[PDB]
Amino acid sequence: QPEMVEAVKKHILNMLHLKKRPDVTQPVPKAALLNAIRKLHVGKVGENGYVEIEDDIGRRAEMNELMEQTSEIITFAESGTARKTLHFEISKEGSDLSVVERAEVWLFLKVPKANRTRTKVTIRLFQQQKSELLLSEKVVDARKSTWHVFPVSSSIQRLLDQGKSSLDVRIACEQCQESGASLVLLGEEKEQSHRPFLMLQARQ
Amino acid sequence: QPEMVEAVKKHILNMLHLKKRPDVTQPVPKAALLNAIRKLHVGKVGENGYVEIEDDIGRRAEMNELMEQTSEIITFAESGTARKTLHFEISKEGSDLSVVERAEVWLFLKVPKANRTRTKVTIRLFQQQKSELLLSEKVVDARKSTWHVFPVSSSIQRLLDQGKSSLDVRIACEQCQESGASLVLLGEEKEQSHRPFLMLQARQ
Amino acid sequence: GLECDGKVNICCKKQFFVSFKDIGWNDWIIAPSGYHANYCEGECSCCVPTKLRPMSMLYYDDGQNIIKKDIQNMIVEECGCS
Amino acid sequence: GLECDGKVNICCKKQFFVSFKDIGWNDWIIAPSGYHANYCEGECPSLKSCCVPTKLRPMSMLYYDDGQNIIKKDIQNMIVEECGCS
C-alpha cells in the first residue's frame, strides 16, 4: 500500500515540476481565496466549502472523445421512380451507429418573386412503407427562396432500429404554386446547388 | 517508397472502419456538395477554392495543448512596511514561464453609502524601484462597493525579463475619502474576503 | 479497452483512486478532490498507455500563491499492447 | 521530444507528409488536403522500452463513402505528434 501511495506522490510532483511537496504554512483566509478564484473564473465554489475547477481541461478532453464517438452523415437525395418522391440510400456507416442524436431533411423552396401575399404554405413529408407515415408537417415562410429544415430524428432512429438503411420520401405542397413557389426535388442546371439532402448525426 | 505509401493507406482505412477504398463513381455536383456542407456548418469553402473542415477536432487539440503550456498564478498581497503599500511575492513557477499573456491587479473599493455625487475617482498604482514608475492610472466608478481591475501586463513582463519576482506597490487615491470610499489593502475581519491580489497568466 | 480485474494477465489497466485526504495533501491541493492513478501492467509489446486524458489542478505553491495548471497525459484512460 | 533527422539512432519521430493527390485519393477525400504520417522508429535501452508515441492528436476527415454519402468523422490518435521511450 505505502510504496504505491508514494509512487503517485512522486508522479504528481514531477508533472508540477516540483522537487518536493510544499512546506506547511498558514494559508490565506478562505473568504479571500474563494472570492478571488470566483472573480477570476478559475474555480467555482459550492456553499459550505466544496470547490470545483472552472474551465477544467479534463472536461474538454471528455468532450473531444464524445465527438470522436459521433459521426455526421450527409445523404443526398436520389430521384424517385414516382412523382414528387426522393430516394435516400444512407451510408453503411449508419450500421455502426446505434443512437440517433440528430436527423434533418433539407429542402430548398424557390421563390422567384418576393411576395408579401400568401406568406404561409404547408409542406408535408411522407415516408413510404408496406402505407405512408408522416415524417414532418411544417408551415414555412414563402417570402423568398430559402432553405427549410425538417426534423425527422425519431423516424430515422426508428428506421435504424429496424435495421433498414433506406428512406423513400413523398413531398406535398398544394399551396406552393399559387404562392409562386416550388420545392427543388431534382438538381436542375445551375439549380443543382439546391439538391435536397438528409443529414444524420449519430454516435456509438 | 511504395511500401510506405501503402502502409499509411491501410492505416487510414483501418481508422475509418473501411476494408477498402471506396469504388470510383460519379459524385454529386460540386455546387451541390459545397452548398450542403456550408449550410450544415461542417465545412468551409471560399473564393472558388478547396474546402477546409469547420469544427476541426485537430484544431481543438492544438488549442488544448496551448492551455497546457499556459499557467495561471494568483499572488496575494502581503502587507508592506510602508503606508498604502502592498508586497507581492510571485511564485517561483513564474520562472518556468517566459511570456506574459495577461497580468492584472485586483483591488476592492469599499463604498458603504451609494453616492450619486462624486462618481469618479482616480486610482494610481506605483511600482517602487532603485524611484517609482506608474503601474496603472485608472479613473473608476465610485457608486457602490465593487472590484476594480488594473492591467499591468507590460510591467510584469518587464519584471520577469529582469529576472525579478517581487513587486512593491504603492496605491494613491486622494478623492476616495470625500467620495465616502476606501480601497481595501488588508484583510479586515469580515472584510478579508476583499484582500487585494495579483493575477498572472503566462506561457512557455 | 481491457480492464484488469484480479486474476487476468493480459495487458489491461488497473484502477486505484487516490484521495488527497488520506495522503495528507488536501491542504495545499485545493482542487480536485483526488487523482485517478490508473496504470498499465501485463505482458505482451510493452503494454503502453494508448488513450491519455489531460487534468487541471488547483493548488498552493506558497502561502500566498495559487496555481491553475493543465497537465497533458496526466490520466491514463485506456491501454493495450504496443 | 526528439526529431529523427537522417543520421540518428535514438528513439525519435520521422515525419513525411502525404498528399491525397499524389496517391489517387483526392477524389473521395474531400478534406483535408493531406495526412501527416508521423511514426516512431528508434532504439531504447533495455521491463523493456518500445519507443512508443507519447503525444497524440485527433484528426477529422471529410470524405465520400458513396456517390451520395458524405461523412464527417473525428478519429482519435490519428496523428503522432511526439514520441519517447516507454
Residue numbers in the entry:
A (entry chain C), B (entry chain A): 51 to 180, 202 to 258, 283 to 299
C (entry chain D): 311 to 354, 389 to 426
D (entry chain B): 311 to 356, 387 to 426
What does the paper behind this entry write?
Activins, members of transforming growth factor β (TGF-β) superfamily, were first isolated from porcine ovarian follicular fluid and identified as activating factors for the release of follicle stimulating hormone. Activins function both in autocrine and paracrine manner. They conduce signalling by binding to extracellular domains of type I and type II receptors and allowing the kinase domains of type II receptors to phosphorylate those of type I receptors and initiate the intracellular signalling. Activins, like all other members in the TGF-β superfamily, are synthesized as larger precursors. During the secretory pathway, the precursors are processed by furin-like proteases that cleave the polypeptide after a dibasic recognition sequence between the pro- and mature domains, releasing the mature signalling domain from the covalent linkage to the pro-domain12.
As we had engineered an HRV 3C protease cleavage site into our protein, we could mimic the furin processing of pro-activin A in vitro. SEC-MALS analysis shows that after the cleavage the pro- and mature domains remain associated with each other, eluting at the same volume as the uncleaved protein and showing dimeric molecular weight of 88.3 kDa. In contrast to the uncleaved precursor, the cleaved pro-activin A complex is highly active in the cell-based luciferase assay with a half-maximal response concentration (EC50) of 29±3 pM (all the EC50 and IC50 values and their s.d. values are determined from three replicates). The complex-derived mature activin A conducts signalling marginally better than the pro-mature complex, with an EC50 value of 20±2 pM, which is in excellent agreement with the activity of our control activin A (EC50=21±2 pM). These data confirm that the refolded and proteolytically cleaved pro-activin A is correctly folded, homogenous and fully biologically active and that the pro-domain has only a marginal effect on the bioactivity. The structure of the cleaved pro-activin A complex was determined at 2.85 Å by molecular replacement using the precursor structure as our starting model. The linker between the pro- and mature domains, with the protease cleavage site, is visible neither in the precursor nor in the pro-mature complex. The palm α-helix of the mature domain appears to be disordered in both pro-domain structures, lacking interpretable electron density. With low nanomolar affinity, and considering the EC50 of 20–30 pM, it is likely that the pro-activin A complex has mostly dissociated at the concentrations required for full bioactivity. The response curves of FST-288 binding to the mature activin A and cleaved pro-activin A complex reached the equilibrium very quickly at 25 nM analyte concentration, resulting in very similar Kd values of 209.0±0.6 and 258.6±1.2 pM, respectively.
